[PDB]
Ligand SMILES: [Ca+2]
């Protein structure tokens with residue numbers, strides 16, 4: 085575990101650090117496992133109850149299952165829906181796959197066993213205009229998802245909440261220029277959302293009903309910078325937020341109050357390599373972070389990188405007892 089590590093030193097230990105990105109505690113990720121020498125748009129990291137890693141690639145729709153110990157890579161099935169972008173495992177073991185469809189309106193969410201059986205349309209694709217990029221389950225089995233639509237000045241995107249019985253969809257926050265990453269705080273009273281095409285971080289304080297925003301509760305604690313923008317995110321047990329930066333070859337880390345406290349660089353970024361860092365996720369029961377990226381832009385491969393985060397990963401829904 086002699087991996088580069090993030091510590092609570094200097095301004096990384098302050099509740100409200102006044103600091104610039106160039107001054108952030110920074111480490112460079114170590115190569116962990118090459119998924120392929122061919123360029124694949126890796127995304128959707130998620131570990132099952134047995135600690136096995138699941139992920140996928142957007143353009144081909146391959147679903148991969150990796151053994152963290154042996155490093156064995158399996159490709160159980162392929163998405164029957166176009167451009168899947170995330171995998172969130174349910175408490176019952178099912179894999180929920182978010183997909184973008186035609187990037188205009190035919191996205192949605194389907195569920196299936198880890199072998200690709202029992203395909204279920206959780207959020208049907210053609211009846212609604214959503215193009216879903218990611219989601220996060222609450223402790224009740226309900227979930228919040230990101231509507232990945234629009235662009236900079238055309239905020240068609242937003243965040244919606246699906247009831248535990250999957251029968252209702254409630255808008256949480258709209259007018260977002262491509263909602264991408266999403267995460268719930270450990271107490272599930274704060275929702276973090278990334279807006280890719282406008283480079284903004286959203287922090288949303290929720291009422292006890294989990295759907296109503298507290299007065300003046302949705303704010304912009306951080307304005308990102310650089311092409312292209314923030315991507316997927318996850319938290320750790322200390323409520324820090326890890327945000328993969330798409331096209332920037334890095335991951336930014338924020339404390340529970342939304343202040344930057346860490347920075348993780350992907351090797352080769354300065355030369356234009358592996359800039360497509362899309363998703364961060366912890367190996368269950370540890371503080372070892374895995375980050376997927378790819379070198380499609382340079383005709384390179386698809387690689388998973390690793391570093392040690394500030395704390396152990398949070399026990400999300402798939403680990404509930
Ligand atoms: Ca749709």
Ligand SMILES: [Ca+2]
Pocket residue numbers: 127169217218264265315316362
């Ligand atoms: Ca994403």
